[PDB]
Amino acid sequence: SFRFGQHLIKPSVVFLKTELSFALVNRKPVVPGHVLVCPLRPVERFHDLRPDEVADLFQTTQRVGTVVEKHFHGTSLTFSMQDGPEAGQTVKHVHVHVLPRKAGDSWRSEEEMAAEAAALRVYFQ
Amino acid sequence: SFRFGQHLIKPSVVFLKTELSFALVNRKPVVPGHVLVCPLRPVERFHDLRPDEVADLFQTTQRVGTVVEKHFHGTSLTFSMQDGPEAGQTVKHVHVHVLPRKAGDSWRSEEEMAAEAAALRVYFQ
Ligand SMILES: Nc1ncnc2c1ncn2[C@@H]1O[C@H](COP(=O)(O)CP(=O)(O)O[P@@](=O)(S)OC[C@H]2O[C@@H](n3cnc4c(N)ncnc43)[C@H](O)[C@@H]2O)[C@@H](O)[C@H]1O
Ligand SMILES: Nc1ncnc2c1ncn2[C@@H]1O[C@H](COP(=O)(O)CP(=O)(O)O[P@@](=O)(S)OC[C@H]2O[C@@H](n3cnc4c(N)ncnc43)[C@H](O)[C@@H]2O)[C@@H](O)[C@H]1O
């Protein structure tokens, strides 16, 4: 299961899932700890998600942010939603990019992704 | 009134204000329509705002996003929270940056800011 634009994302890669949201790992992480949080519903633009699915995606992000900046040794994070194609979007889903940051600071197998997912899954126990 | 890091922001510059959030204009907008949304409470890092003040700031942002991409003729927006100094933060407040975008796409007076604020204030009537 798990939708993400035109393609599905395997549970094996999903490390969090809420009532209205779900979080997963990037196949090509800009930096380590790069993880996304997208609404469960596959709406293409922000203003499309209800006001409920707007709290969940961001309350979740909140966690996913603190559970990833931790496990990757960041000292802060950078969040950024690319809404609309003039914004740079390429997957047609609303979704937040959470990246853990380090002072003056990538492709990988499904299996390696399955581990990153598995590792993180633990901080949400 | 209106706190924003070490300094206060004038109402004249605030174009929206909710129960837990407030929105205002930039003195040095990266691009036109650059406007911020910061929690009413002056907490310095994301994970510090309650789960309530996390829904408001982002439900609000939602609007402020659609009321600004509209009035500045954008075809989409770019949202991005700089959380933590390793992220680039410089004002020690949680706060979202909403910028309206246009295809392949600044200092100003309090008064000019007071107008931008005034103009926008109208879409929230
Ligand atoms: N099936 C699938 N499985 C797994 N992944 C998939 C998938 N399908 C698609 N995907 C995957 O899902 C993703 C689709 O997302 P997307 O297409 O919307 C890309 P974006 O939204 O434009 O990116 P950012 O703005 S966040 O990127 C810029 C970030 O770098 C940071 N940054 C860079 N330089 C900085 C600086 N100097 N200072 C501060 N921050 C800086 C910014 O703060 C910002 O957060 C793809 O990765 C795809 O492979
Ligand atoms: N008293 C006061 N009154 C008024 N204003 C005040 C004030 N005090 C402080 N302030 C004001 O309040 C602000 C304090 O905020 P801040 O210090 O946290 C700066 P930041 O968070 O690092 O910025 P962004 O990441 S959003 O910036 C990068 C943005 O550009 C976009 N971008 C750039 N290149 C891009 C590309 N190639 N593709 C997509 N997006 C791109 C990104 O998507 C992103 O949203 C200051 O402006 C200050 O003067």
Which of the listed residues A38, A82, A83 should we mutate to test ligand 1's pocket, taking the one with most ligand atoms within 8 A of CB?
A82
Tokens for A116? 């990153």
Give the chain A residue whose CA is nearest to the CA of B75: A86
Ligand 2 in reach of B4 Cβ (< 6 A)? yes
Ligand 1 in reach of A28 Cβ (< 6 A)? yes
Nearest CA to ligand 2 atom 30: B30
Q: Is B95 a catalytic residue?
A: yes
Distance CA B125, CA A113 (A): 48
Beta strands in A7-123 (DSSP E): 7-8, 14-17, 21-25, 35-39, 76-83, 96-101
Enumerate the residues of chain B whose CB falls inside 8 A of the CB of residue A47: 62, 65-66
Contacts of A76 (CB under 8 A, 6+ apart): A69, A101, B45, B83, B84, B85, B86, B87, B89
Helix, strand, or coil here: B7? strand
Of residues A90, A96, A41, A76, the one with CA closest to residue B61 = A96
**Domains in chain B: how many in total?**
1
Instruction: Judge whether B7 is annotated as a binding position.
Output: yes
Give the chain A residue whose CA is nearest to the CA of B48: A62
Q: Which amino acid is at B104?
A: G
Give the chain B residue whose CA is nearest to the CA of A97: B80
CB of A8 closer than 8 Å to CB of A56? no
Instruction: Judge whether B6 is annotated as a binding position.
Output: no
Least Cα separation, residue B79 to chain A (angstroms)? 5
Q: Which helix (H) or strand (E) holds B97?
A: strand B96-101
CB of B65 closer than 8 Å to CB of B76? no
Domain with residue A63: its CATH number is 3.30.428.10
Q: Which residue has the tokens 């994070």?
A: A77
CB of A46 closer than 8 Å to CB of A82? no
Contacts of B48 (CB under 8 A, 6+ apart): B94
Give the structural domain span for B7. Answer: 1-125
Across-strand partners of A7?
A: A4
Q: Which helix (H) or strand (E) holds A4?
A: strand A3-4
CB of B50 closer than 8 Å to CB of B62? no
> A124 CA to middle of ligand 1, Å?
23
Across-strand partners of A6?
A: A4
Distance CA A33, CA A65 (A): 9
Distance CA A121, CA A57 (A): 17
